[PDB]
Amino acid sequence: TSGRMIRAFEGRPELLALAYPGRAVLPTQTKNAQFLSTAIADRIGRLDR
Amino acid sequence: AQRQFFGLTYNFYGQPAPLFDLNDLQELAGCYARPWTSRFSHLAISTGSLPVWSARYPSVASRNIIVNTLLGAHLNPFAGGQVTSHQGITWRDPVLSSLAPVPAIQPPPVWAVAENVPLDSNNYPTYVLNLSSMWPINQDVHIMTMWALSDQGPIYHLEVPVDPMPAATTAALMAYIGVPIAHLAQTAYRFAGQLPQSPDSTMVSTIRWLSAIWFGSLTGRLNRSRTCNGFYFEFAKPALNPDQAVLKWNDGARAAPPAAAQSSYMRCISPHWQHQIVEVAGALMSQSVTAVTGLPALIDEATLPAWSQGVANLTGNGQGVVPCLDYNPVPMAAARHLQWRQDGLITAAQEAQLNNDYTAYALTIERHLTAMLVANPIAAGRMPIQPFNAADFGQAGQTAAAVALAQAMFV
Structure with missing residues (x-):
């Protein structure tokens, strides 16, 4: 999944x-x-620039 | 993302030099002395609904027209492969961040004046390397080309596929309920402006449908009794707020998809557009889509002016050549009113009144522009407004074919 972007969930x-x-x-x-x-793998995290 | 584009510069209307002055180059609404991503800067913050114009920018289209003329003098790198200078002014850097007076160290060669020079991004290799930061040039150049090709009004593209609106786009569309067309155009301009985007993208197809839907409502074919996918545009009485058309979603009936794929090029054939915001908004929005995805196909030369006959990557007369339609707002409004009473939204008495109101409204537009033209003769040196003749306000053009297309498009 390297290169993808994912959310943080800081709470x-x-x-x-x-x-x-x-x-x-x-x-x-x-x-x-x-x-x-x-x-x-392509369907992890966000999809668009 | 699309890695190459083509373009064409403006045409001098018999004058010997591009029609702008240094002050115009000094008073752009955006960041200092940069033309890019500036076509809406003069109205990013707004109050009220009155159109914004001034003494040396006397029409809603005047600023954009000036920008197009301005760019025509400095886009040499995409033609000659080199940066040049004109009247002692050139770019700060090969990235073309902004314009500045020529430094006295390595003065670039002086630009040779010419008009209607074809453009190709592949002539300037550094653009490909710095695509991530030079992306907005792609959008603006395409916009300039789409205006340069016409002597009477910007050209833009329409299309509708045979499949229903895909679900992903619908998820995006609901974010734009109840927002007027002008705001939508501004949003569309910003989207394709900042960063490179892929032609295949949910946002791109979303705007494409937006362009189609607005046109369908423009003819009155789409209305609250016949929606595209629940979506349509709502209109105010032309006697007041004649331009505050907004997007609405509705639970009523939906128009069935067309038999075959529809697509064409559109243009306003009357000078009204130069002081009518909605024409500018609609044109820019459609042009924004074409910018990111490129031109689907060549434009038909048959109805275009002389200098536009046979442009390399733009116009043609072969087989795969999409025709271009043009229309006049006044008959268009009549057709829109006629649709409304046929669909029963209004009675015939109202329809007669609406035509009278709109015609009177349009008359002021003509009266304003014609008075404004003599105040800014083109021979002065700058062209704030595009020249025309009085008869151009009366041309019906292909308006009949236009409404025919919409009826064939939404069915």
Whole structure:
């Protein structure tokens, strides 16, 4: 996901992990991990200049 | 993002030099002595609804016209590949940040005076390198070209696809409910002005639809009884606030999509536009879209003035050549009124009154401009307003075809 832009969530930072599922996912082999492995990087964060 | 553009400079109306003076170069409304992103600076802050004009800028279009003439003398890099100077003034830097008196160290060569020189961004390689900061030049040059090609009124583009309005654009459109057209034009100008944008973008397509919708309402084909996608433009009585048309959303019926894709070029064929804000706003808004995306296709030469016949990247007469229509506001208003009574928004008695009101209103516009022309003869040295003849106020042009297109466009 390097190069994309994402929001901050300064009020409580734990939201950051929830806001963008898929980014920096461990290569472990679990049901959720296997699903998240299919996410497309271009659809993280903002979309326009 | 679009990495190349073309253009054309203004035409001297028989005069031997571009029609501006140093004071005009000194009193631009934007940042000091820079023409870029300045076409709305004179009204960024506003009060009331009265049009803004002054002694040496006596028409709503006067400032933009002057800017176009001004740029015609200094755009040599996109023609000759080099920066030049005219009357001891040139750019500060190759980025063309602003104009300044020539320094006495390495004076650039003196510009040779000419008119209607074709322009190509590829003649000036540094633009590509500094695209991120020279982007607004793209928009302004395109605007200048779109005006230079016409002897009577700026040219702009219309189009409507066969698919319904995509959902993404609708999400953007709801941000622009109840805002007048002039403000919308200012917003549209700023968007394509600052940073480079991709031709494929939600914002771009949004403005494209805005241009189409406004034209549909202009003919009266779109109204509160027949919306595009719930959207349409609302009008005030021409007797007062004749220009405060705003955007509205409605739950009523929607016009069905056209049978095939529609597109054409548009122009005002009467001098009225030079002192009528809505024409300027509509033209600029459409031109802004064409600026970022480039010209979809060449324009038909048949109805254009002489110097515009056969411009390299602009005009043609081949197969893939979109025709250009032109109209007169007065018959247009009559057609719009006729649509309103046919759709039942008004009674015939009102329709007769509306035509009388508008014709009287238009008469003042003509009377103002014609009196203003003699006050600023073109031979003086600067052209605050474009010359014309009295008969030009009576030309009907292709107005009948124009309303026919809208009816074929929104159906």
